[PDB]
Amino acid sequence: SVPSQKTYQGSYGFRLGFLVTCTCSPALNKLFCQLAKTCPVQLWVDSTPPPGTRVRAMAIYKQSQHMTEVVRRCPHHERCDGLAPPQHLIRVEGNLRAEYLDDRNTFRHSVVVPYEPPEVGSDCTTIHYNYMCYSSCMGGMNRRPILTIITLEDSSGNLLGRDSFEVRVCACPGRDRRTEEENLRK
Ligand SMILES: [Zn+2]
């Protein structure tokens, strides 16, 4: 079954926040980012989850007619850090404990890091993601919009919380955000 995108704050009050290489549109719930550049995603909790809590990131297609298709890199960007497998769209930057996972039954990719409390000077835990293929790449996303689903999980993989956002990976994020926002006003 297609991974759920249902927002679920859960017992710890889990939700995301956001912070031109990367720009977020709250009105569109959409992140616009350049290829392979830092995308800061903030984790907010009302209380601290138990030891061994994990944070998983996974991409799915937004449109229902493409939801059962695995999101992966196009051949050009696949065939081009030594930790992320070449097929994975999403990689984590600056984390010594990233796990790159392929689901045995769905073939979907994800990247998991341990949950850490907020870094000094912050009320939220910031994770730096990189997207390794453009929304427009033929043989990959092929202009189809995607969602990133962030799941807070216990050490066994049980769901503690879930949030999600749309992503466009593009060369001019600031300009594309304005275009899509101008389209929503019209
Ligand atoms: Zn590509």
Residue numbers in the entry: 96 to 114, 122 to 182, 186 to 291
Authors' account:
The tumor suppressor p53 is inactivated by mutation in about half of all cancer cases. Most p53 cancer mutations are missense mutations clustering in the DNA-binding domain (DBD). Due to its low intrinsic stability, the human p53 DBD is very susceptible to inactivation by destabilizing mutations, resulting in unfolding, followed by rapid aggregation at body temperature.
Y126C is less frequent but still occurs with an appreciable frequency. The Y126C mutation induced a small cavity on the surface of the loop-sheet-helix motif. In the wild-type structure, the side chain of Tyr126 is sandwiched between Pro128 and Phe113, forming stabilizing hydrophobic and π-interactions. The side chain of Cys126 adopts two alternative conformations in the crystal structure, one of which is pointing in the direction of the phenolic group in the wild type, whereas the other, occurring with lower occupancy, faces the backbone of Leu114. Residues 115–120 in the neighboring L1 loop could not be unambiguously modeled, indicating a high conformational flexibility of this region. MD simulations of the Y126C mutant showed an increased structural plasticity around the mutation site, with alternative conformational states occurring where Phe113 collapsed into the pocket but also more open states characterized by a flip of the Phe113 side chain towards Cys124. The flip of Phe113, however, was also observed for the wild-type reference. The strongest stabilization overall was observed for the Y126C mutant (particularly prominent in the series at low temperature) where the mutation site is directly next to the ATO binding site, which becomes more dynamic upon mutation and is, therefore, poised for interaction with ATO. However, the mutation-induced cavities for Y126C and Y205C are relatively small compared with the extended surface crevice in the already druggable Y220C mutant.
